[PDB]
Amino acid sequence: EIVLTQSPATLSLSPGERATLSCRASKGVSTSGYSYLHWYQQKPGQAPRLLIYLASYLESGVPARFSGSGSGTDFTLTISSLEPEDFAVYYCQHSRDLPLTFGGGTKVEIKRTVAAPSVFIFPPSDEQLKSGTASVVCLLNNFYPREAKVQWKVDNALQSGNSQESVTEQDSKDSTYSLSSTLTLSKADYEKHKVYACEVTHQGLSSPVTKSFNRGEC
Amino acid sequence: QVQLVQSGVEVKKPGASVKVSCKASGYTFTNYYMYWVRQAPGQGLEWMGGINPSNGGTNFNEKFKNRVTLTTDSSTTTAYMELKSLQFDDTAVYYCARRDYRFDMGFDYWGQGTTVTVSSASTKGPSVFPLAPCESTAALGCLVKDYFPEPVTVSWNSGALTSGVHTFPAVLQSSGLYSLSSVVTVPSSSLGTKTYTCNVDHKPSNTKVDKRVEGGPSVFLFPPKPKDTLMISRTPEVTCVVVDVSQEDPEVQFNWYVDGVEVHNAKTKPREEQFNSTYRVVSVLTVLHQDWLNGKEYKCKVSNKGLPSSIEKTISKAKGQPREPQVYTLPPSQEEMTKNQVSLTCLVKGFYPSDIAVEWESNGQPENNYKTTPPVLDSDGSFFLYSRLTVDKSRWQQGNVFSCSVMHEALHNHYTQKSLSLS
Ligand SMILES: *[C@@H]1O[C@H](CO)[C@@H](O[C@@H]2O[C@H](CO)[C@@H](O[C@@H]3O[C@H](CO[C@H]4O[C@H](CO)[C@@H](O)[C@H](O)[C@@H]4O[C@@H]4O[C@H](CO)[C@@H](O)[C@H](O)[C@H]4NC(C)=O)[C@@H](O)[C@H](O[C@H]4O[C@H](CO)[C@@H](O)[C@H](O)[C@@H]4O[C@@H]4O[C@H](CO)[C@@H](O)[C@H](O)[C@H]4NC(C)=O)[C@@H]3O)[C@H](O)[C@H]2NC(C)=O)[C@H](O)[C@H]1NC(C)=O
Ligand SMILES: OC[C@H]1O[C@@](CO)(O[C@H]2O[C@H](CO)[C@@H](O)[C@H](O)[C@H]2O)[C@@H](O)[C@@H]1O
Ligand SMILES: OC[C@H]1O[C@@](CO)(O[C@H]2O[C@H](CO)[C@@H](O)[C@H](O)[C@H]2O)[C@@H](O)[C@@H]1O
Ligand SMILES: Cn1c(=O)c2c(ncn2C)n(C)c1=O
């Protein structure tokens, strides 16, 4: 099959700036004067919307600021001046042959000044502990950019497989991200150790930030 | 009026089958292929197959060619997608999309999406646990654990608390039940005074729970010059200046709002190093003359890595009924005539707001040797001021005319004048 690779995975820009999105096919998608390469916009919870068809043709009703170009294996989508409504995900798709394939998408995101996360650790409640479970929640609040690593240490032992992350959408007012990591244990396993630590790394932190508590001393 | 209306949420058990429909209207069904595309949680788009509604001919993706059946009912112009032997990784949004049969111009129209969730779980209400700590800002929240199906909505203090709230998207656990957290950040000082309650609603189980959970840069915002907002020839501007920006964080950022709406036409000046090892940076928003005069609020939000949170500053024209200035010119005192220079006075009073411009001229050329007092509040709520022009006694004795000109929004043509002369 023809594989489409979009780059960059994330594009960080400001309203008014020129956005340039790249799409590269593993095999050529051009034949007989046309390139079978089309662009779509997807907003969270909404169905994709056709922007550009056949590499460079503007779909009826799409704003003039959207333009496509390229041929063979290399394609570009340009937004001449970003509007607040254009911060979304963009996919390329070919139809040179079957199977039809899409690229992995490119997120056009609002750029802003680096903001370090405020890190908080929350021990499990006495209510949850009556049932045989313990959830330790770590919150990384209002940070930018999106990239962050969170590690759990139980008595300085690095954990794996027993935690899940969840990230919010970029904030409509301050353009930041928030993240939560939840370490899950049985009450039996929670009672075996005493130091529960959350170690966070982010561009905005010169050294990792570790938040912890001592089980029983709360 | 082209429409592609898909069927609603599907919650199915592993091994079962689902059948999604796509109701088409506003076009000739026959002229277009109907395609099916799925999107797994947090993943991209995947083409499954397409059907020709005239002859029923199909094309598939090899991954789906043996579990998917595509059919069309031309009477009810509906396309259908049957996915059999459902696996847990079949959880996704399924889209039908049309493609022109005659000439390929992409998937020009898509249905709204049909969420299919493959799960051995049955309806279950969440357990709600408080998230409270064991620093100027405090964090608190609610862990909404083990519920099925989605969604749960979380509010704080019955919708009174909206600022600083983050309700995280749910995580599917190993058990097949969802779980999420809702947090809020608040001033640590409030913890004693204020109460915080999270209101959890899970409509599928009819569950409702209300759980009680128990030095840097500085910004100055300047209004436009009063003459600028009153003359269409001049350009009025609001100015945001941030001082005490660290040598370690040159991060120059401004966001501007007019009556709470963001605008992008401000011009940020280049960073300026100060004699006290800090930077100074200015942003200039040009304003509409009538927007300043109609009382629109101009907000400047400053962001920097050295600011734990953004510094907002607002500025508008003073509220209250505009009142018109009264202009009186008073000649020099006879006791001042024993001097080489004399004082021409201009009394401007009874005006509101205090934004005004006062100047002097003679023979249509500016007289720049004057000083004006700042406006002073009167007991009736209006302002007043005096302007003093220093003239050579000679100039006055020759009967040359001097003029005190005043510019204020409440005046007709924003302008008035009073002349002064030796009788
Ligand atoms: C390092 O070196 C820096 C440079 O020397 C230095 O910067 C200086 O920092 C101080 C604060 O620390 C800042 O002071 C403020 O000044 C406001 C007026 O500034 C005018 O006028 C001065 C001259 O008097 C000029 O030098 C300024 O540049 C500025 O000029 C204006 O600029 C605009 C735009 O370019 C032009 O359009 C104007 O025409 C022009 N005007 C003139 C006359 O030329 C002053 O208003 C501030 O006062 C308010 O805050 C004080 C607390 O900080 C309060 O005590 C005071 O009451 C005022 O409170 C306000 O009151 C309002 C209600 O009445 C409220 O709505 C407001 O919210 C409230 N404000 C606040 C914050 O609460 C203030 O004195 C200097 O201006 C600044 N200098 C420059 C050149 O930028 C750094 O501080 C040095 N750092 C260190 C560590 O030493
Ligand atoms: O937009 C189609 C086509 O028009 C050209 C000129 O042939 O550019 C014009 O239109 C743009 C959008 O309105 C303007 O920004 C530009 O100044 C104007 O010349 C082409 O460049 C474009 O492909
Ligand atoms: O031309 C588009 C756009 O460019 C800006 C960017 O600040 O400035 C240009 O025009 C100036 C003259 O008005 C030049 O001095 C400058 O070099 C040039 O970039 C805007 O003013 C203008 O809208
Ligand atoms: C594919 N295609 C179009 O879709 C098109 C066009 N001119 C206008 N349109 C819309 N041309 C020349 C074209 O080749």
Short mmCIF file of C-alpha atoms in Angstrom, two decimals, chain B residues 4-422:
data_model
loop_
_atom_site.label_atom_id
_atom_site.label_comp_id
_atom_site.label_asym_id
_atom_site.label_seq_id
_atom_site.Cartn_x
_atom_site.Cartn_y
_atom_site.Cartn_z
CA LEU B 4 -25.58 12.28 5.65
CA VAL B 5 -27.30 11.34 8.92
CA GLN B 6 -25.87 8.37 10.80
CA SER B 7 -27.53 6.21 13.53
CA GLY B 8 -26.77 6.85 17.30
CA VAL B 9 -24.32 5.43 19.97
CA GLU B 10 -23.80 1.66 20.02
CA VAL B 11 -22.67 -0.27 23.09
CA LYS B 12 -22.03 -3.89 22.19
CA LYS B 13 -20.53 -7.02 23.68
CA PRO B 14 -17.39 -8.75 22.27
CA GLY B 15 -18.42 -11.30 19.58
CA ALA B 16 -21.67 -9.46 18.77
CA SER B 17 -22.36 -7.52 15.56
CA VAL B 18 -23.25 -3.83 14.95
CA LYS B 19 -25.03 -2.29 11.97
CA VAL B 20 -24.62 1.44 11.41
CA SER B 21 -26.82 3.24 8.92
CA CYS B 22 -26.23 6.38 6.97
CA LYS B 23 -29.40 8.21 5.81
CA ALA B 24 -28.69 10.23 2.68
CA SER B 25 -30.72 13.26 1.40
CA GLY B 26 -30.51 16.33 -0.88
CA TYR B 27 -28.74 14.67 -3.83
CA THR B 28 -28.97 11.88 -6.41
CA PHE B 29 -27.84 8.80 -4.36
CA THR B 30 -26.91 6.98 -7.65
CA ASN B 31 -24.23 9.59 -8.65
CA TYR B 32 -21.93 8.84 -5.63
CA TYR B 33 -20.07 5.98 -3.92
CA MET B 34 -20.67 5.66 -0.17
CA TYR B 35 -17.49 5.07 1.81
CA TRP B 36 -16.88 3.97 5.42
CA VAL B 37 -13.99 5.21 7.55
CA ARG B 38 -13.23 4.62 11.25
CA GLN B 39 -11.26 6.52 13.91
CA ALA B 40 -10.11 4.64 17.09
CA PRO B 41 -9.73 6.73 20.37
CA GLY B 42 -6.91 9.29 19.97
CA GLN B 43 -5.99 7.71 16.53
CA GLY B 44 -6.17 8.72 12.84
CA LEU B 45 -8.52 7.86 9.97
CA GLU B 46 -8.77 4.37 8.49
CA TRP B 47 -10.64 3.53 5.24
CA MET B 48 -12.78 0.38 5.64
CA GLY B 49 -14.67 0.03 2.33
CA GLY B 50 -16.95 1.51 -0.30
CA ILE B 51 -20.15 0.44 -2.09
CA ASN B 52 -21.62 1.48 -5.44
CA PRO B 53 -25.42 2.01 -4.78
CA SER B 54 -26.47 1.36 -8.45
CA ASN B 55 -25.08 -2.23 -8.85
CA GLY B 56 -24.08 -3.03 -5.18
CA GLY B 57 -20.40 -3.52 -6.16
CA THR B 58 -17.97 -3.11 -3.24
CA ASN B 59 -14.25 -2.46 -2.48
CA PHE B 60 -12.63 -3.26 0.83
CA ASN B 61 -9.54 -2.76 2.91
CA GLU B 62 -8.01 -6.32 3.31
CA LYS B 63 -8.11 -5.89 7.14
CA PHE B 64 -11.99 -5.52 6.94
CA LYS B 65 -12.93 -7.47 3.76
CA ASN B 66 -14.00 -10.61 5.76
CA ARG B 67 -15.86 -9.04 8.76
CA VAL B 68 -17.75 -6.15 7.01
CA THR B 69 -20.89 -6.31 4.84
CA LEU B 70 -21.93 -3.14 2.91
CA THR B 71 -25.52 -2.83 1.66
CA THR B 72 -27.63 0.04 0.27
CA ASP B 73 -31.44 0.46 0.37
CA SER B 74 -32.19 2.82 -2.54
CA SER B 75 -35.88 3.08 -1.49
CA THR B 76 -34.90 4.75 1.84
CA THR B 77 -31.56 6.17 0.31
CA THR B 78 -29.74 4.63 3.28
CA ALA B 79 -26.27 3.01 3.28
CA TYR B 80 -25.47 0.32 5.93
CA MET B 81 -22.30 -1.06 7.53
CA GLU B 82 -22.42 -4.38 9.41
CA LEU B 83 -19.30 -5.24 11.43
CA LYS B 84 -19.47 -8.86 12.86
CA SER B 85 -17.49 -10.71 15.59
CA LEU B 86 -16.72 -7.51 17.49
CA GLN B 87 -13.29 -7.22 19.14
CA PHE B 88 -12.28 -4.69 21.86
CA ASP B 89 -10.11 -2.80 19.32
CA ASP B 90 -13.29 -2.14 17.19
CA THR B 91 -14.14 0.68 19.63
CA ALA B 92 -14.11 3.80 17.39
CA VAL B 93 -16.19 6.45 15.62
CA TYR B 94 -17.50 5.10 12.28
CA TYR B 95 -18.14 7.59 9.45
CA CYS B 96 -19.93 7.15 6.14
CA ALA B 97 -18.70 9.61 3.47
CA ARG B 98 -19.70 10.28 -0.16
CA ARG B 99 -17.33 10.37 -3.18
CA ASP B 100 -18.38 11.42 -6.67
CA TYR B 101 -18.75 8.32 -8.87
CA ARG B 102 -18.07 10.25 -12.08
CA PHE B 103 -14.86 12.06 -11.06
CA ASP B 104 -12.88 11.71 -7.78
CA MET B 105 -12.83 15.10 -5.87
CA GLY B 106 -12.35 13.57 -2.39
CA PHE B 107 -14.78 12.73 0.43
CA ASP B 108 -16.77 15.96 -0.07
CA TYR B 109 -19.40 15.18 2.60
CA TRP B 110 -19.23 13.03 5.81
CA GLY B 111 -21.89 11.83 8.25
CA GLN B 112 -21.65 13.02 11.90
CA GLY B 113 -20.01 9.83 13.22
CA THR B 114 -21.33 6.78 15.08
CA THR B 115 -19.52 5.85 18.30
CA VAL B 116 -19.35 2.03 18.75
CA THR B 117 -18.00 0.81 22.13
CA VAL B 118 -17.09 -2.87 22.50
CA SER B 119 -17.35 -3.88 26.16
CA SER B 120 -18.32 -6.82 28.37
CA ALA B 121 -19.45 -4.16 31.03
CA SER B 122 -23.07 -3.33 31.91
CA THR B 123 -24.50 0.02 33.13
CA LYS B 124 -22.80 1.06 36.41
CA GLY B 125 -22.78 4.30 38.40
CA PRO B 126 -19.51 5.84 39.63
CA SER B 127 -18.14 6.03 43.13
CA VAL B 128 -17.02 9.63 43.89
CA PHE B 129 -13.86 10.17 46.00
CA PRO B 130 -12.39 13.51 47.12
CA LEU B 131 -8.92 14.61 45.96
CA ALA B 132 -7.44 16.72 48.75
CA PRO B 133 -3.76 17.35 49.71
CA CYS B 134 -1.98 15.46 52.55
CA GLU B 135 2.07 27.90 48.53
CA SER B 136 -0.36 30.64 47.21
CA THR B 137 -2.47 28.21 45.05
CA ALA B 138 -4.15 24.98 46.27
CA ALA B 139 -5.46 22.10 44.09
CA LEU B 140 -8.53 19.97 44.93
CA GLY B 141 -10.67 17.57 42.99
CA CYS B 142 -12.94 14.57 42.58
CA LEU B 143 -11.95 11.05 41.46
CA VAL B 144 -15.09 9.68 39.59
CA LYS B 145 -14.16 5.95 39.41
CA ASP B 146 -15.69 2.75 37.75
CA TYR B 147 -18.66 3.87 35.69
CA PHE B 148 -20.16 2.53 32.46
CA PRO B 149 -21.10 3.73 29.78
CA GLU B 150 -19.89 7.27 29.04
CA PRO B 151 -20.34 10.15 29.77
CA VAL B 152 -20.24 11.76 33.24
CA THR B 153 -20.40 15.56 33.59
CA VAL B 154 -18.73 17.38 36.52
CA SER B 155 -19.52 20.88 37.80
CA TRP B 156 -18.27 22.73 40.88
CA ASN B 157 -20.41 24.58 43.44
CA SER B 158 -23.48 24.12 41.13
CA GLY B 159 -21.80 26.09 38.30
CA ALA B 160 -20.70 29.05 40.53
CA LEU B 161 -17.05 27.82 40.25
CA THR B 162 -15.98 27.63 36.57
CA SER B 163 -12.52 29.34 36.58
CA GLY B 164 -9.56 26.96 37.19
CA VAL B 165 -11.69 23.80 36.57
CA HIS B 166 -10.27 20.91 34.44
CA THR B 167 -12.48 17.88 33.93
CA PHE B 168 -10.17 15.26 32.42
CA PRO B 169 -11.31 12.98 29.54
CA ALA B 170 -12.15 9.48 30.86
CA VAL B 171 -9.73 6.50 30.82
CA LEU B 172 -10.97 2.97 30.01
CA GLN B 173 -9.53 0.75 32.75
CA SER B 174 -8.44 -2.96 32.57
CA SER B 175 -11.86 -3.82 34.20
CA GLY B 176 -13.79 -2.33 31.27
CA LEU B 177 -15.19 0.54 33.33
CA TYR B 178 -14.37 4.22 32.90
CA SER B 179 -12.75 6.52 35.41
CA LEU B 180 -11.98 10.26 35.48
CA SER B 181 -10.87 13.17 37.63
CA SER B 182 -12.05 16.75 37.93
CA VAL B 183 -9.79 19.27 39.60
CA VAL B 184 -9.98 22.95 40.45
CA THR B 185 -7.14 25.29 41.52
CA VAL B 186 -8.04 27.93 44.17
CA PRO B 187 -6.29 30.54 46.37
CA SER B 188 -4.86 28.75 49.46
CA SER B 189 -6.29 31.63 51.62
CA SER B 190 -9.87 30.56 50.64
CA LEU B 191 -9.50 27.00 52.07
CA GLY B 192 -10.58 28.26 55.53
CA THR B 193 -13.34 30.63 54.35
CA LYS B 194 -14.83 28.87 51.19
CA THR B 195 -16.33 25.37 50.65
CA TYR B 196 -15.79 23.30 47.46
CA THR B 197 -18.30 20.78 46.18
CA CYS B 198 -18.17 18.68 43.00
CA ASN B 199 -21.53 17.77 41.34
CA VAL B 200 -21.22 14.46 39.43
CA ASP B 201 -23.95 13.38 36.98
CA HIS B 202 -24.01 9.98 35.19
CA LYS B 203 -27.29 10.01 33.19
CA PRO B 204 -27.06 6.30 32.03
CA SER B 205 -27.38 5.04 35.67
CA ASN B 206 -29.44 8.12 36.81
CA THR B 207 -26.64 8.79 39.40
CA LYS B 208 -26.14 12.28 40.88
CA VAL B 209 -23.48 12.93 43.60
CA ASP B 210 -22.60 16.23 45.31
CA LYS B 211 -19.33 15.56 47.25
CA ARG B 212 -17.80 18.10 49.61
CA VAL B 213 -14.01 18.13 49.20
CA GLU B 214 -12.25 19.18 52.50
CA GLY B 215 9.15 40.66 42.73
CA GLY B 216 8.17 39.42 39.26
CA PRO B 217 7.32 41.66 36.23
CA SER B 218 4.78 44.54 36.56
CA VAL B 219 2.29 45.80 33.91
CA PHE B 220 1.06 49.44 33.29
CA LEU B 221 -1.83 50.01 30.81
CA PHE B 222 -2.12 53.65 29.39
CA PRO B 223 -5.21 55.24 27.72
CA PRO B 224 -5.04 57.10 24.37
CA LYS B 225 -4.01 60.81 24.29
CA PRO B 226 -7.31 62.88 24.55
CA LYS B 227 -6.69 64.80 21.22
CA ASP B 228 -6.23 61.47 19.36
CA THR B 229 -9.67 60.05 20.12
CA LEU B 230 -11.40 63.37 19.07
CA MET B 231 -9.74 64.01 15.66
CA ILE B 232 -10.25 61.42 12.80
CA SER B 233 -6.86 62.58 11.37
CA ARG B 234 -4.93 61.37 14.47
CA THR B 235 -4.44 57.71 15.64
CA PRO B 236 -5.63 56.80 19.23
CA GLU B 237 -3.73 53.95 20.97
CA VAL B 238 -3.85 52.00 24.23
CA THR B 239 -0.29 51.07 25.51
CA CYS B 240 0.70 48.04 27.66
CA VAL B 241 4.17 48.33 29.23
CA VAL B 242 5.76 45.45 31.18
CA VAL B 243 8.80 46.29 33.39
CA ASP B 244 10.97 44.04 35.62
CA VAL B 245 11.15 41.25 33.02
CA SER B 246 14.08 38.97 34.19
CA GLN B 247 17.34 38.62 32.28
CA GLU B 248 16.53 34.82 32.57
CA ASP B 249 13.02 35.08 30.93
CA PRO B 250 12.93 37.46 27.88
CA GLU B 251 9.57 35.67 26.85
CA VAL B 252 7.80 38.75 25.27
CA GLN B 253 3.89 37.82 25.23
CA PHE B 254 0.66 40.02 24.94
CA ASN B 255 -3.03 39.09 24.36
CA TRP B 256 -5.54 41.96 23.73
CA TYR B 257 -9.35 41.94 24.18
CA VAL B 258 -11.97 44.61 23.30
CA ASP B 259 -15.14 44.03 25.44
CA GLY B 260 -13.81 40.49 26.17
CA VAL B 261 -13.22 39.63 22.45
CA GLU B 262 -9.64 38.90 21.35
CA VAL B 263 -8.08 41.17 18.64
CA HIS B 264 -4.76 40.48 16.76
CA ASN B 265 -3.77 43.88 15.29
CA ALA B 266 -1.49 45.07 18.22
CA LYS B 267 2.19 45.79 17.46
CA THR B 268 4.82 44.63 20.01
CA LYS B 269 7.95 46.77 20.15
CA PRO B 270 11.44 45.21 20.33
CA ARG B 271 12.71 44.26 23.85
CA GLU B 272 14.65 47.11 25.65
CA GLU B 273 17.41 46.39 28.27
CA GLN B 274 17.24 48.70 31.32
CA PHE B 275 20.07 50.11 33.53
CA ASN B 276 18.86 47.79 36.44
CA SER B 277 19.60 44.41 34.69
CA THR B 278 15.91 43.92 33.53
CA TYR B 279 14.01 44.24 30.22
CA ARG B 280 11.16 46.63 29.37
CA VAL B 281 8.65 45.65 26.61
CA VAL B 282 5.71 47.68 25.15
CA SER B 283 2.68 46.55 23.02
CA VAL B 284 0.53 49.15 21.21
CA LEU B 285 -3.12 48.51 20.31
CA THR B 286 -4.56 51.12 17.88
CA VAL B 287 -8.19 51.80 18.78
CA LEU B 288 -11.28 52.98 16.91
CA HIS B 289 -12.14 56.62 17.92
CA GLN B 290 -15.82 55.75 18.50
CA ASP B 291 -14.99 52.49 20.37
CA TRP B 292 -12.99 54.43 23.00
CA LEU B 293 -15.80 57.09 23.19
CA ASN B 294 -18.57 54.41 23.43
CA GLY B 295 -16.97 52.99 26.64
CA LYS B 296 -15.38 49.77 25.26
CA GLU B 297 -12.95 48.09 27.73
CA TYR B 298 -9.43 47.39 26.49
CA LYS B 299 -7.76 44.47 28.32
CA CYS B 300 -4.08 43.63 28.15
CA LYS B 301 -3.02 40.10 29.37
CA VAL B 302 0.78 39.63 29.85
CA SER B 303 2.43 36.15 29.81
CA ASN B 304 6.04 35.33 30.76
CA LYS B 305 7.82 32.19 32.12
CA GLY B 306 8.70 34.26 35.25
CA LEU B 307 4.99 34.93 35.96
CA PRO B 308 3.25 31.97 37.81
CA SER B 309 -0.01 33.26 36.19
CA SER B 310 -0.84 35.97 33.58
CA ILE B 311 -1.09 39.67 34.55
CA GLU B 312 -4.36 41.15 33.22
CA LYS B 313 -4.99 44.97 33.17
CA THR B 314 -8.16 46.74 31.87
CA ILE B 315 -8.82 50.36 30.85
CA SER B 316 -11.87 52.24 29.57
CA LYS B 317 -13.11 55.79 29.29
CA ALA B 318 -14.68 57.05 32.59
CA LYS B 319 -18.41 56.26 32.97
CA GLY B 320 -21.00 58.93 33.61
CA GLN B 321 -22.99 61.50 31.58
CA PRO B 322 -20.56 63.54 29.38
CA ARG B 323 -20.70 67.25 30.31
CA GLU B 324 -19.51 70.09 28.10
CA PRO B 325 -16.66 72.44 29.09
CA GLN B 326 -17.31 76.17 29.64
CA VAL B 327 -14.35 78.29 28.43
CA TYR B 328 -13.59 81.75 29.90
CA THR B 329 -10.50 83.81 29.06
CA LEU B 330 -9.31 86.27 31.71
CA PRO B 331 -6.91 89.19 30.86
CA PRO B 332 -3.68 90.00 32.80
CA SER B 333 -4.06 91.73 36.16
CA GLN B 334 -3.29 95.49 36.00
CA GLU B 335 -0.79 94.81 38.88
CA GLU B 336 1.25 92.53 36.49
CA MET B 337 1.69 95.36 33.84
CA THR B 338 4.91 96.53 35.59
CA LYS B 339 6.75 93.43 34.05
CA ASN B 340 8.36 92.50 30.64
CA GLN B 341 6.02 89.46 30.44
CA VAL B 342 2.24 89.06 31.30
CA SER B 343 -0.06 86.08 32.05
CA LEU B 344 -3.12 85.30 29.86
CA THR B 345 -5.47 82.90 31.68
CA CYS B 346 -7.97 80.40 30.34
CA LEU B 347 -10.54 78.88 32.73
CA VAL B 348 -12.10 75.58 31.42
CA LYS B 349 -14.80 74.19 33.77
CA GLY B 350 -17.89 72.06 34.16
CA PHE B 351 -16.59 69.20 31.93
CA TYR B 352 -16.80 65.42 32.29
CA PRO B 353 -14.99 63.08 31.83
CA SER B 354 -11.61 64.77 32.71
CA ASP B 355 -10.01 63.82 29.27
CA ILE B 356 -9.38 67.16 27.52
CA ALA B 357 -6.79 68.95 25.37
CA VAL B 358 -6.16 72.71 25.76
CA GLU B 359 -3.80 74.81 23.56
CA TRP B 360 -3.01 78.39 22.64
CA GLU B 361 -2.50 80.23 19.35
CA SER B 362 -2.21 83.64 17.81
CA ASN B 363 -2.69 84.53 14.14
CA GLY B 364 -3.12 80.81 13.22
CA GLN B 365 0.24 79.65 14.60
CA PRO B 366 0.77 77.76 17.92
CA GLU B 367 1.81 79.72 21.07
CA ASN B 368 3.94 77.13 22.95
CA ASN B 369 4.89 79.17 26.10
CA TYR B 370 2.03 77.94 28.37
CA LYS B 371 1.30 75.50 31.18
CA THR B 372 -2.02 73.90 32.06
CA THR B 373 -2.97 72.57 35.47
CA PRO B 374 -4.19 69.00 35.78
CA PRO B 375 -8.05 68.73 35.98
CA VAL B 376 -9.50 69.21 39.47
CA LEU B 377 -12.72 67.60 40.73
CA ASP B 378 -15.56 69.96 41.71
CA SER B 379 -18.29 69.34 44.30
CA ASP B 380 -20.88 68.83 41.45
CA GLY B 381 -18.82 65.90 39.97
CA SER B 382 -17.44 67.88 36.99
CA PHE B 383 -13.81 69.03 36.43
CA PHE B 384 -12.06 72.30 35.92
CA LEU B 385 -8.66 73.63 35.00
CA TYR B 386 -6.76 76.82 34.21
CA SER B 387 -4.24 77.31 31.43
CA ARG B 388 -1.70 80.15 31.68
CA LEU B 389 0.01 81.59 28.59
CA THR B 390 3.12 83.81 29.15
CA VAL B 391 3.34 86.61 26.54
CA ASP B 392 5.78 89.49 26.22
CA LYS B 393 3.88 92.65 27.51
CA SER B 394 4.81 94.27 24.11
CA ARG B 395 2.79 91.61 22.14
CA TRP B 396 -0.33 92.27 24.32
CA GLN B 397 -0.13 96.13 24.16
CA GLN B 398 -0.09 96.03 20.31
CA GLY B 399 -3.63 94.48 20.30
CA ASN B 400 -2.61 91.04 18.98
CA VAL B 401 -5.37 88.42 19.47
CA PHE B 402 -4.62 85.24 21.51
CA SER B 403 -6.84 82.13 21.54
CA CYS B 404 -7.38 79.39 24.06
CA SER B 405 -8.59 76.32 22.10
CA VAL B 406 -10.33 73.38 23.85
CA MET B 407 -11.07 69.84 22.59
CA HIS B 408 -13.52 67.58 24.43
CA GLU B 409 -15.95 64.81 23.37
CA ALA B 410 -19.02 66.64 24.75
CA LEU B 411 -18.39 69.74 22.49
CA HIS B 412 -19.98 69.95 19.00
CA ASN B 413 -17.16 69.08 16.50
CA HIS B 414 -15.16 68.23 19.65
CA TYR B 415 -13.82 71.78 19.54
CA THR B 416 -14.32 75.32 20.91
CA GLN B 417 -12.27 78.45 21.25
CA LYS B 418 -12.17 81.77 23.15
CA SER B 419 -10.13 84.78 21.98
CA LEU B 420 -8.41 87.35 24.18
CA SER B 421 -7.27 90.90 23.41
CA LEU B 422 -6.52 94.35 24.84
#
